[PDB]
Symmetry: D2
Subunit: 115 residues, 4 copies
């Protein structure tokens, strides 16, 4: 799989488990169409979202349902979600890890792109 999503919890110091993740691809009509989704595992990781065959160059959106996660922990959050929007680029083989570190009023995201 060319795309992994990993979510961590900065309040509890733990993987963020059972977080819903939705991936969209930008369509020619310039709207976001759903592509793949899942929930993070006990390790905070979400594997198997797509395939090398399916994950062609394009503009993608990864939406992480952070609000439902904090609501389940009883902590008032600021953001409705975390979005990561990026253009994929075939240039040799590549794997993308989208990692997000969550706090109730802050999040960070980084992309680790490896061969």
């Amino acid at each position: 799989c060319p795309l992994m999503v990993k979510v961590l919890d900065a309040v509890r110091g733990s993987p963020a488990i059972n977080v819903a993740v939705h991936v969209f691809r930008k369509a020619a009509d310039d709207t976001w169409e759903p592509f793949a989704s899942g929930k993070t595992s006990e390790s905070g990781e979400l594997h198997g979202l797509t395939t090398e065959e399916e994950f062609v160059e394009g503009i993608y959106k990864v939406e992480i349902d952070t609000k439902s996660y904090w609501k389940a922990l009883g902590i008032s959050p600021f953001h409705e979600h975390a979005e990561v929007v990026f253009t994929s680029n075939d240039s040799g083989p590549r794997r993308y890890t989208i990692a997000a570190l969550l706090s109730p009023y802050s999040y960070s995201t980084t992309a680790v792109v490896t061969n």
Copy 2:
């Protein structure tokens, strides 16, 4: 102004100057309607986007054009932009973003 946006550059250790910022508000038909826009100043700050009267309850999206920023510095970054989406239930909101080519962070400082 109840909303201010501050953008910093974690590569240069400087304010991120002249960054385009667009604010949208979700309408009754669930579409994103344009609300306000501007550019960050020499201090990295964008003041005066809206007023207390205009900034009613609702769901807002702040879109920071980080890609154009990095490309102007010769860097091809990962993200198309940095988004912040939030509900206002009411206060002053500062939306701060810290930028690197393959990472960004955003935090909200909400004071009264």
Copy 3:
């Protein structure tokens, strides 16, 4: 003042108020000598730690007492403190720290 420290709370979305900050400078014998200290204000900012004349070239450590901050809020955090160690080769330095119980970030904004 050439050095200002700003501390924010990523759980509450607020400035981190009354946080203790200690600054050290490395001496010729490679020991850390105390240089200045203070507490963050209601804005999360600590101004006036030093002066242009006192803040000479050298290696500095800013130690932010994040543990006492979280414990006062009922949280047992991971880190004993947040450190920033840097060389001044000269300018205004803003050292900003964003705090969560098991994570912190720090950035330097260096302007002229």
Copy 4:
């Protein structure tokens, strides 16, 4: 191993490879004594620093030589290093991952503590 260190590069979007990492334990004389060290792998990870037998409750410092890393990339950095100082706590089994995300003028660190 109860302690892992992982370092990522936010400029290149990659693991931070060959970064030196030094671990110290606070001694009774209240000075930092070296305990373990190594360099990050191609995955940005440093495994095998210590053992469950050796890693007793105490105050630890993890020092990451970020300055040498940025100097090797030709990018002027702000920090001399990144330090993570923490007290370990036996409370059921525990593994600590200390993760650091590096930029030339900024770094973040988080602890992922799992069973």
